[PDB]
């Protein structure tokens, strides 16, 4: 499933027109990206949380070259899947259908 | 930011009523959970992908007890943040505002 196919699906479930479904998906996405960029967290119950995390200085092998190199600290985005999402994927809880 | 606050925001950006914004966020979430449960993948460009992954048998320390135990294989959900999301969080690319 890609964005288009997601948007198709969401259009049927929303009984919306498609443009509308497209604004929804773009602006959910956009909003989350924006909060985490600020370093804020987005917690969605039954889904998971999006957060910014900080990578400490580390060291890397440069694979094109072989040359080892030290990596300056970086902020990254990340998602922790919530208990209900895990439960369903794993087989523990049933999906409501 | 929690679901409510996300929903507030999305309501303003959608110029929707709130119930509508709530259906959007619930059914985006629900749809993704459902695809990954099937083991399908959800790829959203400029965001990232949601996928099911399989954890091999491993072994665990039971921390309540001390007792070491072997873990049977499990399917888990996961999100790989896409290049544009990483770029923005890291500081490499600018957010459009
Ligand atoms: Mn199931
Ligand atoms: Mn920036």
Give the closest of A20, A28, A40 to B10, CB-based: A28
As for how many domains chain B has, the answer is 1
Q: How many CB atoms lie within 10 A of CB A81?
A: 20
Resolution in Å, one decimal place: 2.5
How would you list the strands of the sheet with B48-55, edge to edge? B42-44, B48-55, B74-81
CATH of the domain at A60: 4.10.520.10
Q: How far apart are the C-alpha atoms of B25 and A84, rounded to whole Å?
A: 16
Q: Look up residue A6 and give its two tokens.
A: 């997601």
* Pairs of CB atoms within 8 A across A/B: 135
Ligand 1 centre from A93 Cα, in Å?
A: 7
Q: How far apart are the C-alpha atoms of B44 and B50, rounded to whole Å?
A: 8
Ligand 2 centre from B29 Cα, in Å?
A: 27
Domain containing A66 equals 1-97
Local structure of residue A2 (DSSP, 8 states)? B
Which residues lie closer than 8 Å to A20 by C-beta, 6 or more apart? A11, A14, B14
């Amino acid at each position: 499933m890609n964005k288009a196919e997601l948007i198709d699906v969401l259009t049927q479930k929303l009984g919306s027109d498609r443009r509308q479904a497209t604004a929804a998906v773009e602006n959910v996405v956009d909003t989350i990206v924006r909060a985490v960029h600020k370093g804020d967290s987005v917690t969605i119950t039954g889904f998971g949380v999006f957060e910014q995390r900080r990578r400490a200085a580390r060291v890397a092998r440069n694979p094109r070259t072989g040359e080892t190199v030290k990596v300056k600290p970086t902020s990254v985005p990340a998602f922790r899947p919530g208990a209900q999402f895990k439960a369903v994927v794993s087989g523990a809880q049933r999906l409501p259908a």
